[PDB]
Design a protein around this ligand. Structure first.
Ligand SMILES: CC(C)CCC[C@@H](C)[C@H]1CC[C@H]2[C@@H]3CC=C4C[C@@H](OS(=O)(=O)O)CC[C@]4(C)[C@H]3CC[C@]12C
Length: 251
């Protein structure tokens, strides 16, 4: 008892970090180690050309299908975050519409080869050239830059998990009813994140460089929405008849 009281503080941070870590491990589509062992499996030049030969609307549908799969896994992660399921359906929805893509881009770092500038996509590792038919060179370059920048921090699986839970439970998304409860939850997650960050590299204070990325993610997800609305103005029926329903609902 007396010993239990002396540990209660940090024990609680460790407990929450382990909870979130586990939720992350069990809701990622692929194992980190799996992804790292096949970075050499890049598309061959012939396959690259084929993707480049596809029509704009065709490449967009494919990417939306692939992104929707990753989002499905992020929704499973959210469900397991303590507090998320206690919120009103309305706040649950607002946090997912705003954060599900941000968590995807965070998870992208586990499936990104920084030295060669390539991302795991449709079975192989893809250079930015694979996405040329989208007609979004700037948005694509921003995505890869983000991948490179998060990789350069060599975040551990537990670090990625707590950072995912952090930008997901943000109390500043517009239209939230329970700002105070969500805020108290993010604060805990953040103390837990700092706890695990210092466990590995009290060498710096990267928590700030990480929290700095938060603003970059919002701009990245903001551009996605802009590009998508621009695409939907030209291909309204492609979006309506061939885009995945969950992607439509979210974006
Ligand atoms: C306009 C929009 C549709 C274009 C987006 C094109 C690229 C940026 C997308 C398409 C498909 C996306 C991947 C789909 C699937 C995954 C698996 C996911 O793996 S997991 O193990 O972490 O769950 C990590 C993100 C990752 C690598 C995504 C990165 C981002 C990704 C390459």
């Amino acid at each position: 008892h007396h010993l239990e009281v002396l540990f209660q503080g940090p024990a609680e941070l460790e407990h929450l970090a382990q909870n979130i870590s586990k939720s992350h491990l069990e809701t990622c589509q692929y194992l980190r180690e799996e992804l790292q062992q096949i970075t050499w499996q890049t598309f061959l030049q012939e396959e690259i050309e084929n993707y480049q030969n596809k029509q704009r609307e065709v490449m967009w549908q494919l990417c939306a299908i692939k992104i929707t799969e990753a989002i499905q896994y992020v929704v499973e992660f959210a469900k397991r975050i303590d507090g998320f399921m206690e919120l009103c359906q309305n706040d649950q929805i607002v946090l997912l519409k705003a954060g599900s893509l941000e968590v995807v881009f965070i998870r992208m770092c586990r499936a990104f080869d920084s030295q060669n500038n390539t991302v795991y996509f449709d079975g192989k590792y893809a250079s930015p050239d694979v996405f040329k038919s989208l007609g979004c060179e700037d948005f694509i370059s921003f995505v890869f830059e983000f991948g490179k920048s998060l990789c350069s921090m060599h975040l551990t699986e537990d670090e990625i998990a707590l950072f995912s839970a952090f930008v997901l439970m943000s109390a500043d998304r517009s239209w939230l009813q329970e700002k105070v409860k969500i805020e108290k939850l993010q604060q805990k997650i953040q103390l837990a994140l700092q706890h695990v960050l210092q466990k590995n590299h009290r060498e710096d204070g990267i928590l700030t460089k990480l929290i700095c990325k938060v603003s970059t993610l919002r701009a990245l997800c903001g551009r996605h929405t802009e590009k998508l609305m621009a695409f939907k103005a030209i291909y309204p029926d492609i979006v309506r008849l061939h885009f995945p329903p969950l992607y439509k609902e979210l974006f």
